[PDB]
Each structure stands twice: as structure tokens, then as C-alpha cells.
Nucleic acid binder design. Structure first.
Ligand SMILES: Nc1ccn([C@H]2CC[C@@H](COP(=O)(O)OP(=O)(O)OP(=O)(O)O)O2)c(=O)n1
Ligand SMILES: [Ca+2]
Ligand SMILES: [Ca+2]
Length: 343
DNA sequence: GGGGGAAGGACTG
DNA sequence: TTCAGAGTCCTTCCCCC
């Protein structure tokens, strides 16, 4: 069983350059604006030409312009990218029936019984990595191994515009050299904890006791990690499925007064139902972002589907349920639906 | 007595 | 006065056929 991981080199900012040729040869920064502060918002992405100086996705636009002020800041357009991605996913779909799309710029391929060895697999990464670069003019990084996790790591190492292959003899090697947070699934927090205790490489975990690991990161986190070092990871490539389609916005405000939030919720509660397709959610939650970070949420599950209007109503009771439980103003407010109806 | 629901946190990425 | 913008899965926890 050998996997083929695909990762769009560096998506957004890249597509933005593909459409506007007068961009390349410059540090581009695709980000999200809110309409406030003046330059309020965060960074969604940036080309490698812009990363060099630190402008990494997720930071305040005000900071970005603190390091790379001359760079090229372009507004985010999830609509434009969505379509591109939607196209690339379809190609890969012809190379292997068993496909699994993770995010908007990722996809796992299973070639187990359509490839003889890592030799003709690396040749396939190319045959693919190319059909892509010129049919959509998008560069991508490919990863290959015996499973999804290692396949995804080989792609991390080889980026950008590359491809790598983590063979078995190499795997055992990585399980020793591969370290800290460079592990898919383990976030900064879990890392700033493990490190403090000496655990650096994915192996250091084996010199512990499953329980002493659980008491600090969790049974899932641990079991997962120990499943890697032990080298017995399973997880197959199955078709993905939308579980929770939601939408959130941002108030130029920072309010607490219902009619100073109702229009907002209503707004989001509109866009979400457009993505719901022909789905019927039995569950709905109102996510609310405050000011001093920390998000708050209140939701409810129904024994039947939901109609837009049905949503509007509960939205309020769920919002009041929030306010009366916190003494801080709100900045962004949103809603998320789930538990769609089966077959 | 494993599961459904609700609020929180983290990693997505 | 007024910072940093979609979806999944793990968890602490209370509760019931
Ligand atoms: N805080 C973040 C981080 C990433 N993304 C977006 C960036 C596009 C998509 C995938 O991100 P990555 O793959 O991590 O980066 P990339 O630039 O898309 O590509 P690469 O992984 O090769 O750097 O998710 C985002 O919306 N918010
Ligand atoms: Ca990518
Ligand atoms: Ca990615």
C-alpha cells in the first residue's frame, strides 16, 4: 500500500499571480480585510518571495506592512480559488478512483494496485505534477510513502515545486531524525509542552509510558504519535464528506446590542444556507468572537431538519444565551450547521 | 456503558 | 480609546435507555 499526497505549492498568492502576470517577480500577500481599523484584517497567504521576510499567513495586516511594506497586498477571493482547486481535484480524479480531498489545496491518492513500486510512483508524481502545471498553470508538491501521514511529510520537506519519496528504509530513519512539531496533527501547544520534557524526535515518545504521555496531550494525540514511531499507522483513503458548513463575518463594531448584531447574524445565516446545498441540518451553533480573543458558542440540536426561518429564530435565543453569560463586547459573530440528513 | 448533546481548545493549515 | 480573517476533531462532563 503506497500513497500519493498532492499539495498546491502555495495556492492563493500563486493563483493570484497566474491571473495577473504583472505580479510575479514580486512579494505578493493575499489577505483578508474587515473594514475597520483602516487596514484591519489578517494574512491569508503569501508567496515564498514574501515569506522570506516573515510575512506568514495568519498575522495582522498591520504587522505585515511593518516588515514588507513595499510588498503587494491583494484582497482575498475565495470564490476565484475555489473554482481553480475544483478543477485540479478533477484531474487527479482520473488517475485514481480512491481519492480523498482534505482541504482546498490538498488531496490524497491511493495507487496501491495501479503502481508496481516506488519507481513508477515517482514517475507518476511527475506525470501528474505536470498535467497540473500546464492545464491550470499551477505548481504543486508531491509526497509519496506507505501512508497518508508520511506521504504528507515527504511533501513538506520537498516543497516548493518539488516531489519526494519516503521509502521504508528511509521511514525508520525519519522516525528518528524527524522531530518536534514538524509532525502533522501536533500543534504548537502540544510541542511547547513535549519539548520542555526532552521529547524532540518522534522516537523520544517510545521511551515513555503511554500513560505519562496521555497525561499531557491526550489519549488520541498520544495513541496517534505512538502509532507512528511504532510504524503501524492505518487510516485509509476514503471519500471525504462535508460535516459542518458555516459562515462568520465581522462587525465594523464591537457590540452587544441585538439590533447591532442581528443584521450581521442574519447576513451570515444567509450565506451559509447557500452552501448547505440540498442538505438539512438538525444542529446549529452561533459562534461569537469577542475582543480579547477567546471565542464563545451556544447551540442546539433538533429532531428534524431546519428551514432558514427556523434558524433565524433560534439564532437570537442562542445569542442572548451568550451575552448574558459574558461581560465582554463582541467583534465577530457567526453560525454553523451540522448533523445533516442521511439516506 | 457506550453514546448524544453542549461549551471549550486545538490543529486545520 | 479599540489588535488577528472554514471546517474538523479531541476533550471535560453531565446524563439515559
Ligand atoms: N492560517 C492560515 C494558514 C493557511 N491558510 C490557507 C493557505 C491556503 C490553504 C493551504 O495552506 P498551506 O498548505 O499550509 O500553505 P499554502 O501556501 O497553501 O501552500 P504550502 O503548504 O505549500 O505552503 O490554507 C489559511 O487560510 N489560514
Ligand atoms: Ca499547499
Ligand atoms: Ca496544506
Amino acid at each position: 500500500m503506497i500513497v500519493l499526497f498532492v499539495d498546491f505549492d502555495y495556492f492563493y498568492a500563486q493563483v493570484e499571480e497566474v491571473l495577473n502576470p504583472s505580479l510575479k517577480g514580486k512579494p505578493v500577500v493575499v489577505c483578508v480585510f474587515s473594514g475597520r481599523f483602516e487596514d484591519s484584517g489578517a494574512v491569508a497567504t503569501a508567496n515564498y518571495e514574501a515569506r522570506k521576510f516573515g510575512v506568514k499567513a495568519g498575522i495582522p495586516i498591520v504587522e505585515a506592512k511593518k516588515i514588507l511594506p513595499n510588498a503587494v497586498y491583494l484582497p482575498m477571493r475565495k470564490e476565484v480559488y475555489q473554482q481553480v482547486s475544483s478543477r485540479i481535484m478533477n484531474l487527479l480524479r482520473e488517475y485514481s478512483e480512491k481519492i480523498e480531498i482534505a482541504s482546498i489545496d490538498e488531496a490524497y491518492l491511493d495507487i496501491s494496485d495501479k503502481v508496481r513500486d516506488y519507481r513508477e510512483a515517482y514517475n507518476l508524481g511527475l506525470e501528474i505534477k505536470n498535467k497540473i502545471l500546464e492545464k491550470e498553470k499551477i505548481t504543486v508538491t508531491v509526497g509519496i510513502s506507505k501512508n497518508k501521514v508520511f506521504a504528507k511529510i515527504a511533501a513538506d520537506m520537498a516543497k516548493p515545486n518539488g516531489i519526494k519519496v519516503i521509502d521504508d528504509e528511509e521511514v525508520k530513519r525519519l522516525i528518528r531524525e524527524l522531530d518536534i512539531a514538524d509532525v502533522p496533527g501536533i500543534g504548537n501547544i502540544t510541542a511547547e509542552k513535549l519539548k520542555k520534557l526532552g521529547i524532540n524526535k518522534l522516537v523520544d515518545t517510545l521511551s515513555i509510558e503511554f500513560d505519562k504521555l496521555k497525561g499531557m496531550i491526550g489519549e488520541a494525540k498520544a495513541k496517534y504519535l505512538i502509532s507512528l514511531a511504532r510504524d503501524e499507522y492505518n487510516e485509509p483513503i476514503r471519500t471525504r464528506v462535508r460535516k459542518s458548513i458555516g459562515r462568520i463575518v465581522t462587525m465594523k463594531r464591537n457590540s452587544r446590542n441585538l439590533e447591532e448584531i442581528k443584521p450581521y447574524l442574519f447576513r451570515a445565516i444567509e450565506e451559509s444556507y447557500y452552501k448547505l446545498d440540498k442538505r438539512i441540518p438538525k444542529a446549529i451553533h452561533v459562534v461569537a468572537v469577542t475582543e480579547d480573543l477567546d471565542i464563545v458558542s451556544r447551540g442546539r440540536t433538533f429532531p428534524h431538519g431546519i428551514s432558514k426561518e427556523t434558524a433565524y429564530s433560534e439564532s437570537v435565543k442562542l445569542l442572548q444565551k451568550i451575552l448574558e453569560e459574558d461581560e465582554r463586547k463582541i467583534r465577530r459573530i457567526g453560525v454553523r450547521f451540522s448533523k445533516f440528513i442521511e439516506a
